[PDB]
Swiss-Prot record, chain A:
<keyword id="KW-0539">Nucleus</keyword>
<dbReference type="GO" id="GO:0006367">
    <property type="term" value="P:transcription initiation at RNA polymerase II promoter"/>
</dbReference>
<comment type="function">
    <text>Regulates CDK7, the catalytic subunit of the CDK-activating kinase (CAK) enzymatic complex. CAK activates the cyclin-associated kinases CDK1, CDK2, CDK4 and CDK6 by threonine phosphorylation. CAK complexed to the core-TFIIH basal transcription factor activates RNA polymerase II by serine phosphorylation of the repetitive C-terminal domain (CTD) of its large subunit (POLR2A), allowing its escape from the promoter and elongation of the transcripts. Involved in cell cycle control and in RNA transcription by RNA polymerase II. Its expression and activity are constant throughout the cell cycle.</text>
</comment>
<dbReference type="GO" id="GO:0070985">
    <property type="term" value="C:transcription factor TFIIK complex"/>
</dbReference>
<feature type="modified residue" description="Phosphoserine">
    <location>
        <position position="130"/>
    </location>
</feature>
Swiss-Prot record, chain C:
<comment type="subunit">
    <text>Component of the Mediator complex, which is composed of MED1, MED4, MED6, MED7, MED8, MED9, MED10, MED11, MED12, MED13, MED13L, MED14, MED15, MED16, MED17, MED18, MED19, MED20, MED21, MED22, MED23, MED24, MED25, MED26, MED27, MED29, MED30, MED31, CCNC, CDK8 and CDC2L6/CDK11. The MED12, MED13, CCNC and CDK8 subunits form a distinct module termed the CDK8 module. Mediator containing the CDK8 module is less active than Mediator lacking this module in supporting transcriptional activation.</text>
</comment>
<comment type="similarity">
    <text>Belongs to the Mediator complex subunit 7 family.</text>
</comment>
<comment type="function">
    <text>Component of the Mediator complex, a coactivator involved in the regulated transcription of nearly all RNA polymerase II-dependent genes. Mediator functions as a bridge to convey information from gene-specific regulatory proteins to the basal RNA polymerase II transcription machinery. Mediator is recruited to promoters by direct interactions with regulatory proteins and serves as a scaffold for the assembly of a functional preinitiation complex with RNA polymerase II and the general transcription factors.</text>
</comment>
<protein>
    <recommendedName>
        <fullName>Mediator of RNA polymerase II transcription subunit 7</fullName>
    </recommendedName>
</protein>
Curated annotation (Swiss-Prot), chain D:
<dbReference type="GO" id="GO:0070516">
    <property type="term" value="C:CAK-ERCC2 complex"/>
</dbReference>
<dbReference type="GO" id="GO:0005737">
    <property type="term" value="C:cytoplasm"/>
</dbReference>
<dbReference type="GO" id="GO:0004672">
    <property type="term" value="F:protein kinase activity"/>
</dbReference>
<feature type="modified residue" description="Phosphoserine; by CDK1 and CDK2">
    <location>
        <position position="152"/>
    </location>
</feature>
<dbReference type="GO" id="GO:0005886">
    <property type="term" value="C:plasma membrane"/>
</dbReference>
UniProtKB/Swiss-Prot annotation, chain E:
<comment type="function">
    <text>Stabilizes the cyclin H-CDK7 complex to form a functional CDK-activating kinase (CAK) enzymatic complex. CAK activates the cyclin-associated kinases CDK1, CDK2, CDK4 and CDK6 by threonine phosphorylation. CAK complexed to the core-TFIIH basal transcription factor activates RNA polymerase II by serine phosphorylation of the repetitive C-terminal domain (CTD) of its large subunit (POLR2A), allowing its escape from the promoter and elongation of the transcripts. Involved in cell cycle control and in RNA transcription by RNA polymerase II.</text>
</comment>
<protein>
    <recommendedName>
        <fullName>CDK-activating kinase assembly factor MAT1</fullName>
    </recommendedName>
</protein>
<comment type="subunit">
    <text>Associates primarily with CDK7 and cyclin H to form the CAK complex. CAK can further associate with the core-TFIIH to form the TFIIH basal transcription factor.</text>
</comment>
<feature type="modified residue" description="Phosphoserine">
    <location>
        <position position="21"/>
    </location>
</feature>
């Protein structure tokens, strides 16, 4: 993003993210203990990896909810919403804001920023909830919308890995004739992109490089390699150096994708019961 | 545009409607070889109001110098560096609704000696 | 831009001198529309145009000028 | 620390002061909306766009969302305080008719427009105002509420948007798609006003404004960009004989004459581009653009 | 990097998801604007 902005919000490497999530978990734990509602280290407090697993399963459910939206939705808007949701829990804890409220809100704010100009009946129709309960959730949605931007540091733009894909394919139709009619390449690349989106890839790698790696994985799976295209990018600065960095990033991406798996529902329900009990616990804020 | 000294420009309608107030307008009729769009009187017309603005914005300001009511109306071209600072560029004199450029005391004499000899 | 006092015809003239032989003849009496000066000044017209063209007429066709004046 | 109450705004309220932190002067915005519905739409689209777009667009000729907070229902946006605005300045009775100063204002506006076009985000609504002048006088663009991105994917492009006095001819037709054309024609009308001193084309309502634009530039030629009537909504306008740019603004230096002719060109395709306009030789000429040290200031 | 005018194979291909269309072309937005935005954005970044 030569447009800066996300230049500040591009966390560089796996450990920093791990550390930040861990620290927010500690932060909530401590505020609560200090308030002194409870003695330290009671059963209710959760663990960060468990919180992350619950978040991922619920986020896959949120992606299904985005897909079943009655009005047609651009892939950009879905992506914007997921990114916003991941970045939100890098600053706070699952318990402080229940994941359901956060998911719905990320979605409405996202639609407003991306100019989908959603109709109010269409949004209410998509939700499978009682109008009164949907209105109760909508009241919370308002307050949590402002809360989201506050903890989002007001950095709203999100780079979506699509645009680059269309662009690289046009470069494909022009600079290299070695490969041909790369559309099988197109669908496989989409399959790799959804799997890439579920990972912390959005946060770590550059999105253009993410699209290029999806194209490369599709090519390797089907029978073509782009050494020559990589060679046209070598027709550039860094002389030999660019290629080693590209290969290392591609290998790390492949490793995360192979290791990432959907959390089992049996484990997820245990976690759900625990968190539900947790928010049912006494927080209460201030007078 | 070959020689500004050797050009004369006129217009009959403006001739009967000519007065000390309208001399600048006659020079300003446009399509007049002596005057130019670059002059600030033109900028003032393009904007609004003509008052002490020639002393505020200082630059090319054609101003009437001496006037005889019936015909004689002399105009001077000034270039101002600042208020109370005037630099005279040239003089264009209008006789009988006919505009000429005032000849230099020396260019006229050079041409004159050349023809006689 | 800056047109001069009008010049003499240059379009013709060269033909009229010719060699003193084979000259262009007098142009024919164009009995229609011409453009002297700036006005059309076309032929076939009256002397006092009726006031009916351009204004109301408050006087009947008897028009005994001395009485109506 | 709120220290001044400049006044309310179209969808906002403004106060001028020093914040909880440093003593530096800044303008503070407070969010304004109709929250009566128990089903409010949360924040407004204009607000959402304006905040992120200003934050992203950082340029010596673009204002920027600096600090931003929102502990209460209130959402606070921090923008630097500016001196006034070109619009009221030239609106007032001639205090200082200043020729080359108009050229300097045009240069700052064009540099801001070039940066915004490069960043790939159209300024949907430059209006005569909505342009602000600071104490130094560097003019940076400001209102960003109606802006949107412009890209390859087909999407519902918003329609009938710019203020009627300054309206792009393609938008006046009823066109479903658009390009840098809107912003270029509008800078063009603002220059028109600086030279003419009063607004160029007056439209009480859509049709009258289209008729007046056509009267000012004549009927567009069939060669221009035929399909001008083939866009979705077109009505043959009067068959005006047409007037040269020389007719509407009577005169100035012809280089200015050329920039104008160029921003105006009818085919949206030919409407001159930002880089193209800076590269115009008119900017690199004997008249010098004002540094802004001598830029005119009223009261 | 990428040039503003295409006059290349990309312009010759002139093909997008819907390629280009005539009536809206009055609207301007010749696909040209289109591929330029697309490529520029994609190329943005690639190396943090």
């Amino acid at each position: 993003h030569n447009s800066s902005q996300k230049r500040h919000w591009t966390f560089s490497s796996e450990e920093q993210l791990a550390r930040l999530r861990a620290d927010a978990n500690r932060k909530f734990r401590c505020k609560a203990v200090a308030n002194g509602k409870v003695l330290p280290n009671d059963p209710v407090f959760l663990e960060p990896h468990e919180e992350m697993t619950l978040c991922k399963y619920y986020e896959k459910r949120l992606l299904e909810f985005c897909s079943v939206f009655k009005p047609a939705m651009p892939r950009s808007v879905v992506g914007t919403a997921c990114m916003y949701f991941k970045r939100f829990y890098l600053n706070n804890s699952v318990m402080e804001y229940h994941p359901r409220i956060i998911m719905l809100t990320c979605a409405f704010l996202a639609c407003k920023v991306d100019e989908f100009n959603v109709s109010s009946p269409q949004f209410v129709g998509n939700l499978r909830e009682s109008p009164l309960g949907q209105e109760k959730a909508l009241e919370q949605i308002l307050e949590y919308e402002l809360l989201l931007i506050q903890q989002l540091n007001f950095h709203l733009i999100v780079h979506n890995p699509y645009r680059p894909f269309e662009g690289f394919l046009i470069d494909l139709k022009t600079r290299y004739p070695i490969l041909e009619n790369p559309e099988i390449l197109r669908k496989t690349a989409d399959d790799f992109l959804n799997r890439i989106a579920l990972t912390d890839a959005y946060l770590l790698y550059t999105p253009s490089q993410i699209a290029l790696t999806a194209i490369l994985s599709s090519a390797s799976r089907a029978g073509i390699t782009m050494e020559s295209y990589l060679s046209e990018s070598l027709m550039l600065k860094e002389n030999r150096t660019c290629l080693s960095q590209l290969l290392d990033i591609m290998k790390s991406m492949r490793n995360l994708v192979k290791k990432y798996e959907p959390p089992r529902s049996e484990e997820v329900a245990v976690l759900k019961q625990k968190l539900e009990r947790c928010h049912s616990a006494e927080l209460a804020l201030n007078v | 545009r070959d020689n500004l000294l050797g050009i004369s420009w006129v217009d009959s309608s403006w001739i009967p409607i000519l007065n000390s107030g309208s001399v600048l307008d006659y020079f300003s009729e446009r399509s007049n070889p002596f005057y130019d769009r670059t002059c600030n009187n033109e900028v003032v017309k393009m904007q609004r109001l003509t008052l002490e603005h020639l002393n505020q914005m200082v630059g090319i300001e054609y101003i009437l110098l001496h006037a005889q009511e019936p015909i004689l109306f002399i105009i001077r071209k000034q270039q101002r560096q600042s208020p109370a600072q005037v630099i005279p560029l040239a003089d264009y004199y209008i006789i009988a609704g006919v505009i000429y450029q005032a000849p230099d005391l020396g260019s006229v004499i050079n041409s004159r000696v050349l023809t006689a000899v | 831009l800056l047109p001069p006092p009008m010049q003499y015809i240059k379009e013709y003239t060269d033909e009229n001198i010719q060699e003193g032989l084979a000259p262009k003849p007098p142009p024919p009496i164009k009995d229609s529309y011409m453009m002297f000066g700036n006005q059309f000044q076309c032929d076939d017209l009256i002397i006092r145009p009726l006031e009916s063209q351009g204004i109301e007429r408050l006087h009947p066709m008897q028009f005994d000028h001395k009485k109506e004046l | 620390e709120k220290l001044d109450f400049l006044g309310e705004g179209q969808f906002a309220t403004v106060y001028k002061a020093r914040d909880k932190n440093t003593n530096q002067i800044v303008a503070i915005k407070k969010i304004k909306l109709g929250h009566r519905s128990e089903a409010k739409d949360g924040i407004n689209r204009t607000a959402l766009r304006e905040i992120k777009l200003l934050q992203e667009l950082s340029h010596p000729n673009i204002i920027g969302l600096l600090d931003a907070f929102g502990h209460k229902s209130n959402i606070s946006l921090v923008f630097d305080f500016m001196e006034t605005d070109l619009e009221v300045i030239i609106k007032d009775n001639s205090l200082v008719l200043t020729p080359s100063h108009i050229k300097a204002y045009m240069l700052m506006t064009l540099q801001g427009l070039e940066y915004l076009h490069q960043h790939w985000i159209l300024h949907r609504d430059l209006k005569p105002n909505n342009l602000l002048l600071d104490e130094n006088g560097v003019l940076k663009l400001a209102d960003f509420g109606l802006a949107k991105s412009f890209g390859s994917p087909n999407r519902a492009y918003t329609h009938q948007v710019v203020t009627r006095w300054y309206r792009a001819p393609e938008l006046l037709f009823g066109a479903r798609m658009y390009g840098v054309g809107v912003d270029m024609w509008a800078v063009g009308c603002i220059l028109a006003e600086l030279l003419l001193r009063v607004p160029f084309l007056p439209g009480d309502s859509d049709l009258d404004q289209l008729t007046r634009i056509f009267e000012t530039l004549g009927t567009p030629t069939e060669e221009q960009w035929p399909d001008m009537c083939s866009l979705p909504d077109y009505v043959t306008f009067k068959s005006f004989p047409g007037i040269p740019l020389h007719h509407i603004f009577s005169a100035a230096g012809d280089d200015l004459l050329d920039l104008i002719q160029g921003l105006f060109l009818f085919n949206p395709c030919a409407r001159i581009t930002a880089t193209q306009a800076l590269k115009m030789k008119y900017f690199s000429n004997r008249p010098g653009p004002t540094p802004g040290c001598q830029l005119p200031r009223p009261n | 990097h990428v040039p503003e005018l295409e006059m290349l194979g990309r312009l010759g291909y002139l093909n997008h998801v819907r390629a280009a269309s005539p009536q809206d072309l009055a609207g301007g937005y010749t696909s040209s604007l289109a591929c330029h935005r697309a490529l520029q954005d994609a190329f943005s970044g690639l190396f943090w």
